[PDB]
Structures are given as C-alpha cells and as structure tokens.
Amino acid sequence: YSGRDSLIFLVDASKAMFESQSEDELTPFDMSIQCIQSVYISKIISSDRDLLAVVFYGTEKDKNSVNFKNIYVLQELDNPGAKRILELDQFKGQQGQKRFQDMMGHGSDYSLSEVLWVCANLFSDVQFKMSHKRIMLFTNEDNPHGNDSAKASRARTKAGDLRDTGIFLDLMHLKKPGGFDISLFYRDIISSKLEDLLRKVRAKETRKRALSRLKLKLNKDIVISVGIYNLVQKALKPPPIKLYRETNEPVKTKTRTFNTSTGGLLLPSDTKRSQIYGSRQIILEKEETEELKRFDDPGLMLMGFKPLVLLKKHHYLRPSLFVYPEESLVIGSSTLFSALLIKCLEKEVAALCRYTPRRNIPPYFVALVPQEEELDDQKIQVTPPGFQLVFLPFADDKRKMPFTEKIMATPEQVGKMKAIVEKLRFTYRSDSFENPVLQQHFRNLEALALDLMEPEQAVDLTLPKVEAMNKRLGSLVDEFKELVYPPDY
Amino acid sequence: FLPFSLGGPFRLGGHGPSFPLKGITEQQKEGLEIVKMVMISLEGEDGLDEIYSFSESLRKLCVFKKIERHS
DNA sequence: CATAATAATAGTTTTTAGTTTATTGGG
DNA sequence: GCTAATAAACTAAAAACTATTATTATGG
16 A cells, blocks of 8 residues: 655745744744754655645735735645755845845735645646645634635635535644744634654664465364564665766666686586585585575465463574464454453463465464453553564574583672662563664765755764763762772783 | 384374294394393483383484573 | 447556565684 | 684565556457
C-alpha cells in the first residue's frame, strides 16, 4: 500500500501578519516561516513520499492556475527540495519580510472561498494516489467575517464541499495563544501544536508495508495464512551515490569479470565456484551452491510446544519479530489465531517451530512467545497480540569461555552498592535516545545543502553526563568506596 | 568403544534397549571387564564434558566440533 | 477458421546476505 | 621477536505493493 500525504500552508498577508501583535518580538510572519521551514526539514529527513505547497491569500500581483484575485501561489504540490528551502528562507526575518513587501506587498482582501477553490485545484493537480490530505491555516483573525455574509456563506458551502471530498483544514490561535479566544466563527464546522511543529523532530522513517506473508503449517494438511511484521530495524545512513567531480553527474557503474590471459570477457555461466581443502581444489557450480543453501520450502512447520522456561536472557540471536494472521488466501485463519492468542494464560508453554523466512535458505528453529493485547485506557493498542519470533541458537553458536570460578563476596559491599544504585535511579524510557551518528549525519546534510555558515550540533541524550548523576547520588559513591588498593594503576 | 551402541528413546528409528551379553565370546567379556576396571577410575576431561559414543560420533561431526578461537 | 470483447501475465521498490577495510595477534 | 578473526563496507541484495499490456474461455 502506497500513498502520498499532503499538507498545504495558508497564511494571511494583508495587514495583521507583519505586526508586533501586543508584543515586542518578531511579527507572526517570521516564526510562521520558521515553523514551516522546520516542518520542511522534518519531512525531508522523515520521508520523500509526500508533497507540500505554500499559498498566500491577500495578493497584489496574482499568480495561480485559475488567476483569481488576492490569490498567490508560491510553491505547488511537490516533494520538498533544497531549492524550496532556499526560496522559503529568502523571506525569513525582517529582511525577508521587507523583501516580501518589495516583491509582493501587503493589504489585499481575503477571499476564503477562492482559497478553498485554489487548494482543491492543487489537489486535483497531482496525479499520485492521495493517501491523506490536510490543510493548516494560521492567522491572527479569530473571525474575519465582518464583511458581507455572502462570502461567509460561500466559504461555509465550500468547506462542506471539501469535507465531502475528504479535505480537512486546521486553524489555531496566533494572535492570543491560550484562552480559547480563537475560532469564534470557525468553531462551527471546523475541528497547542505550535511547539510540536516547532520541535521539528526528525531522523525518523515511516513504515510503508509489511513483508513475508507465510503459512503456519501445523501438519502436512492444515495451514494458516500469516504475515511476519517487523517492529525494529537497525537504521543506517542512505548509501552514498557515486558522482562525477566536475559535473556532479550520476555514474553508470559497470562491474564485470575479465581475463588478462586473452583480454576477453567471461559470462556468469562459465565461471565456476572453487574451494580449497586438504590436497584437492574442490570445484562447485553456482546453481549447486544455491541448491546447497536450499533446504525446503518457506513455511512454519509446527514442531511442538515448549514451556516458557527454556528461553534464557543469555541465549539470544537476531531480533525477534511479530506475527499476525493474514486472511487473503486462507480464510478462518484470523478467528483460529485469535482463539489461540486469547488462550495464553493457560498457554504459557511456548510454541516451538522451525522458521524458513524465504526460499532456498536453511531453516532456524524459532520459538513463539504469545504476545498480549496491551490495550491502553486511551484506546491505544501497543504491541497487539501475536507471537514473538525468538531465534534459538545452534550448538555451534556458543563460544567457549574460560572456566575461572569466583566465590560469593561480602554482603556489606553488596548492600552499599544496593543503596548506591537505588539512590541513582534512572526512569528508563524506550523512546528516549537517538543514534548520535545518524542524527549528526542528518545535521550535516541539512547544513551542507543550504547556504548555512556552520552546522548545528544537536545535543544527544546518549552522551553520559559528568556530574549530574554524581550529584543525584552525592559523594557517597566515593565515601562508600572502601575497596582496598583500587585497580587503578 | 563397544561395536554396538552404548548408553524419547524412539523418536524416529532409534536403537534397541539392550542386547544379549552372555552369548558373546568370553574373550570379549574379559576384555570389556579389563577395560572397564581400568577406566572407572579414569575417563578423560572430554568424557566428563561429553563422551564420544559409538552412535553420537556416527550421527554427527561431534569430534569435528566447529568453533572459533578465543574471543 | 473473423472481432464492441477479455483477463493472468508481466513491471517499480522496500529491506538481509552475501564480501573489504582495518587492528590485537609468534617459531 | 613479519602475519591480527577484527565487523566502518564489503556488493549488489529472490521484495510487493500499485500501476499497465498480451490472451482469450466468447458475440460471430
């Protein structure tokens, strides 16, 4: 399943968007530009399968497809790009505001129905599948309808039209944040995020589709259609793209085998695999090697049920995954699987199976820990019920350790470090850390793509502090440290 | 090592529980007695870990024991 | 052995298993 | 007293979803 998400930015530009607004800081325009720039950066680092656009209502020099009055379109629906970032940042700050005034002006008449018209036209413009559409609109007007009520009625009609079409609009306080003083009129049929958007959290990708719809074969007769769903993947930087120094042109890389004996070229068919063992040069075929890697057909042949005691923390392998029934070519799988899942309190004994994720690969035995339905009171189902794909290590997977033995230590040190670690308690949060390398790489990209003077070095929570935990624990860490002759040299 | 197997008894084509031992050559019984009276006091650290048996060696590359060097 | 047809084949993208760089390592 | 089992890329990754074009079972 693919589909592009769209978010369109609409901001007032007539008179109240370039004012102090009962403040001494910058006009709403400046940090509105900052916020939309932040969401541009977040989207760029997040996903490139989405389109964004910017339109201003209130216009002295109109430019749009339908050529209405007081309607100006800057950037249409398109994937965000560095040139878009430059275009947006050209109109940031006071210098950006005055440049905008020089090339755009201010002080026209809003026409909300025309805005809805042009935004609907923009949505019609894209030829891609629209998974989701969203409109945001920020202005200092809680009710800009002191003008003719005909315009208000037409705007309401167009809002109903776009709601029927599936378009949703967003507006929130800008003039007087807080107090529920905004949307005096828009509260009828239209339903703070400033910090959330300004936080511009990035370096997060998004899942598009699952994988590996496999069969649970309990026997040679009955099968169950299920799909293995990932939940964690080791993220990494996008692969480098080979380019030409002079022209920054993509390079048609062309790798091939060759022979210096005759200067000709070898086909992938006449090049045979070879091995060396003992006193012989073992020769093999590529297809023979592939068959050697092949053991049986992909599937999940149930092997039995093993009590949830053989699993040990020190016995671990490649990450476990999630299993969900998928009734696309076998029906009745979902109901039976659900019946199995709910009966887990008695089914503490974990299911045993040998796993063949894909074709022509050796199978690994994998236990199936029944996942639970951890529904939240906020109606959020975290980790829906299923099975854990815990991999069982083989006999050859264990490396022998020295058999040095140590006897129990004194309990007074045990108690003193018990107090130490109890005082030094850290509330673990699963989503509380990001890889410094990847986020730093993203900072470099966003930096060395604009005309940025120097890069920003985002502070990570991974780096241990020097004294914050020490003061959180006090000096008792050294006061209680009564070990004789510390191993320090 | 006895020519026969030593030691889910029948999961898939297993060995018999036991075989007659009074019908074998008396010399073989004497040799088994001699080797066992020498061996009960000394078997080997590998045997303490796991004994190379007649059937386990045959089934798998038990003596091969693929493993890497010290980490 | 024809033509308002019809569909069961293909084709673009996600993510794992392949191999080179480099650092503790003696007779 | 000169030969490391390290793990950054090695190298080109058996993947589906959502998009169109060739067969026909048949009107003739």
